[PDB]
């Protein structure tokens, strides 16, 4: 097998035709490739490009042992919760970032992609959970949340709710309720040979 370097598959994540629900968020491990973060631009107007602990302008001169790209879709007014030190339905039960997060959060409006006149109920999120999510934890359990004191026996009903909630994105919604595609780049530096570098 030959010594040839790959070009980092950032197009597989940022340009996926369908993103995951935030409760079941995708993670792609980027490794053993040359990353060119210079292609990450020209998203929907007034997108968010929010980095923490690393400068995105120096990114093309840095090396890391691994890079992780987590992707999902959320509501417009939930975007602020995808950052360190945040509370809310998303940061508490669906996707959590730690205080020492070193990485970037790219989030852009996807109303033209993910909204439907009949409503897009495919994108969902967890509305009830017994406790807060640990950072980078993923929960995909469809177990009936028991709000009351009677057991639910896996049946939705009085005080027994199905824990996931569909967004139902429609294009005529306001921006706070419109869908936003989100990609979370995590740059990891370990005691190991750095295998993701810029040009």
């Amino acid at each position: 097998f030959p010594n040839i370097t790959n070009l980092c598959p950032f197009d597989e994540v940022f340009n996926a035709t369908t993103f995951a629900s935030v409760y079941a968020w995708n993670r792609k491990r980027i490794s053993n490739c040359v990353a060119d973060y210079s292609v990450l631009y020209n998203f929907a107007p007034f997108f968010a490009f929010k980095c923490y602990g690393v400068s995105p302008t120096k990114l093309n001169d840095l090396c890391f042992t691994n890079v992780y790209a987590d992707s999902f879709v959320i509501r417009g007014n939930e975007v602020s919760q995808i950052a360190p030190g945040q509370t809310g339905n998303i940061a508490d039960y669906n996707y959590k970032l730690p205080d020492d997060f070193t990485g970037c959060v790219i989030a852009w409006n996807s109303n033209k992609l993910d909204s439907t006149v009949g409503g897009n109920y495919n994108y969902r999120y967890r509305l009830f959970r017994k406790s807060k999510l640990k950072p980078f934890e993923r929960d995909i359990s469809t177990e009936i949340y028991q709000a009351g004191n009677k057991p639910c026996n896996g049946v939705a009903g009085v005080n027994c709710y199905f824990p996931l909630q569909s967004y139902g994105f429609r294009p005529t919604y306001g921006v706070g309720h419109q869908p936003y595609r989100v990609v979370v780049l995590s740059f990891e530096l370990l005691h190991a040979p750095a295998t993701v570098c810029g040009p």
């Binding site: 409503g119 509305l127 009830f128 709000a147 009351g148 004191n149 009085v158 005080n159 709710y161 909630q165 139902g168 429609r170 005529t172 919604y173 306001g174 921006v175 706070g176 309720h177």
Partner: protein, 595 residues
């Protein structure tokens, strides 16, 4: 788990399902109102049936949580609002019949056409055609023809529908434990469980009837003044003692006397006009009207209109491709979707109505922060008054001079201020007896007080008695003339426009103190006062979370509606009208009628 934590979790799950169903029902209703088709009707029916069957089960489930152990008040409020007299359980057969009556009356009003007796192809609708004749014509015969043709062809069409409309609306109200549909609408103002701030359904009838009696003197003098200036315009058609013919009043029903200004200006020639002409001269657009209204709300700290508002609203007549309900309305569909539906012409009437409807939307946006069940105005009067306290400021010559519709050097002498106060009186004061009588007739018809065989004998007995306006043609009981108004045939409560008219001058008085205005109220313009907008916004953001008595007392200092500020606003005109009716008669007798 405590009952409160369970009630919270129930309300959370409720709000996410309710917002999605409310949006579908709202959007279905929008599609019908902008575009009247048989397919859009049954879509509105299906989305409305799903929405009520949802409330049917949710209001039942909400009984499982007793209020007496909810310590968090805002949780208590959502629970109360969900089990409260909104069951609207009707049988499937009777629920479908009331909808057919409602949809038919709705379709007839907006698509009703009077056609040439000799040429069936050329017809006039109410909105583009007949309104122009009733607002701009000066021929006695032409106005009479339009007044009668609309009430004879469309009015008679609505008479049998309205009779069965009340027998079903009354049956619905009784199943929800009200005396009648009129008591149901009155329940909008009801407040109980709050010491000193409570307000009953019956207390509105007393407060409207007594506040209106304090209004009788001011309106009777304006009535006599308009009578004299109308005597000049029309040779032998009006006597100095009789009522005012109903087809000469400025619009289709005489709801406002605003278009009578051209005939009644006290000082008309020498003071520059305060009306539409300069808009047309400056080639103003329906977009310019709303952009100027948007500019006004922003100047007090309120937000812009959303991007979706401009993309999704219908702000001009769509044409003959679709049949639209052209009457100006404001829409809060939820999910950040705000729209106005209005067939905007380039008039000063439409310019001020833009401020009215945008006032609704600004209220909707302000209390969007509330829980779903509390997103509404304090009462219907509050909602219909927000745009009016801005219209008060935008109508003043100070503001029109600063937005370029009056000369850059305007002479604001003693005389131009009386012109302003009169035109303000033609609209605001003129609509008060019209409003009170119409709603009182509905209440009296909803209640068992006006039988079928004399529905129009009493409607005109109350027009001549209370309003001072007489039928030019005798109408038998085949006619239904109140239903020829948008709000009556479209199932809207009308007393909202009476209570708001007192509310606005109360609010405007408090807001002009916030902006440190110096003179009498009618010179006040709150345009660039971000402090005045702050006082207003701190109430708009509340929604239905506080009773209207407390929300009103925390801004104006009065737990109730009051007539004082309205009368201070019009005092210079009140003492001026007295001087003009020296050799005239103030009042009228019911014993005179053309035919």
């Amino acid at each position: 788990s405590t009952i409160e934590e369970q009630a919270k979790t129930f309300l959370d799950k409720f709000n996410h399902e309710a917002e999605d169903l409310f949006y579908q029902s709202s959007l279905a209703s929008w599609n019908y109102n902008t575009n009247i088709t048989e397919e859009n009707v049954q879509n509105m029916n299906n989305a409305g049936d799903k929405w009520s069957a949802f409330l049917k089960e949710q209001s039942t489930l909400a009984q499982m949580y007793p209020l007496q152990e909810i310590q968090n008040l805002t949780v208590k409020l959502q629970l109360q609002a969900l089990q409260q007299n909104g069951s609207s359980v009707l049988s499937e057969d009777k629920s479908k019949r009331l909808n057919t009556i409602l949809n038919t009356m709705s379709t007839i009003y907006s698509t009703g056409k009077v056609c040439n007796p000799d040429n069936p192809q050329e017809c006039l609708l109410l909105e583009p055609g007949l309104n122009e004749i009733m607002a701009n014509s000066l021929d006695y015969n032409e106005r009479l023809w339009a007044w009668e043709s609309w009430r004879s062809e469309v009015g008679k069409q609505l008479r049998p529908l309205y009779e069965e409309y009340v027998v079903l609306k009354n049956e619905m109200a009784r199943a929800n434990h009200y005396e009648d549909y009129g008591d149901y609408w009155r329940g909008d103002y009801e407040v109980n469980g709050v010491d000193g701030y409570d307000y009953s359904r019956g207390q509105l009838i007393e407060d409207v009837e007594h506040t209106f009696e304090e209004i009788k003197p001011l309106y009777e003098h304006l009535h006599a003044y308009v009578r004299a200036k109308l005597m000049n315009a029309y040779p032998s058609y009006i006597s100095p003692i009789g009522c005012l013919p109903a087809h000469l009043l400025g619009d289709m029903w005489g709801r406002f006397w605003t278009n009578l200004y051209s005939l009644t200006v006290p000082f008309g020639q020498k003071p520059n006009i305060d009306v539409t002409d300069a808009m047309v001269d400056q080639a103003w657009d329906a977009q310019r009207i709303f952009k100027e209204a948007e500019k006004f709300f922003v100047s007090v700290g309120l937000p812009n209109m959303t991007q979706g508002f401009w993309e999704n609203s219908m702000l001009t007549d769509p044409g003959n491709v679709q049949k639209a309900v052209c009457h100006p309305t404001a829409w809060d569909l939820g999910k950040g979707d705000f729209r106005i539906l209005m067939c905007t012409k380039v008039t000063m009437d439409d310019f001020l109505t833009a401020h009215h409807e945008m006032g609704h939307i600004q209220y909707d946006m302000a209390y969007a922060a509330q829980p779903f069940l509390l997103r509404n105005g304090a009462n219907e009067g509050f909602h219909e008054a927000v745009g009016e306290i801005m219209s008060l400021s935008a109508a003043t010559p100070k503001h029109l001079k600063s937005i370029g519709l009056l000369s850059p050097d305007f002479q604001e002498d003693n005389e131009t201020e009386i012109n302003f106060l009169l035109k303000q009186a033609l609209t605001i004061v003129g609509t008060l007896p019209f409003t009170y009588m119409l709603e009182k007739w509905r209440w009296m018809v909803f209640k068992g007080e006006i039988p079928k065989d004399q529905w129009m004998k009493k409607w005109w007995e109350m027009k001549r008695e209370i309003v001072g306006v007489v039928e030019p043609v005798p109408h038998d009981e085949t006619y239904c003339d109140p239903a020829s108004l948008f709000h009556v045939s479209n199932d809207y409560s009308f007393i909202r426009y009476y209570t708001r008219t007192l509310y606005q001058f109360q609010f405007q008085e408090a807001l002009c103190q916030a902006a440190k205005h110096e003179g009498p109220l009618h010179k006040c313009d709150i345009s660039n006062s971000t402090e005045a907008g702050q006082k207003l916004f701190n109430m708009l953001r509340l929604g239905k979370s506080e009773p209207w008595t407390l929300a009103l007392e925390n801004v104006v200092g009065a737990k109730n509606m009051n007539v004082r500020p309205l009368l201070n606003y019009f005092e210079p005109l009140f003492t001026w009208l007295k001087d003009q009716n020296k050799n005239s008669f103030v009042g009228w007798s019911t014993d005179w009628s053309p035919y």
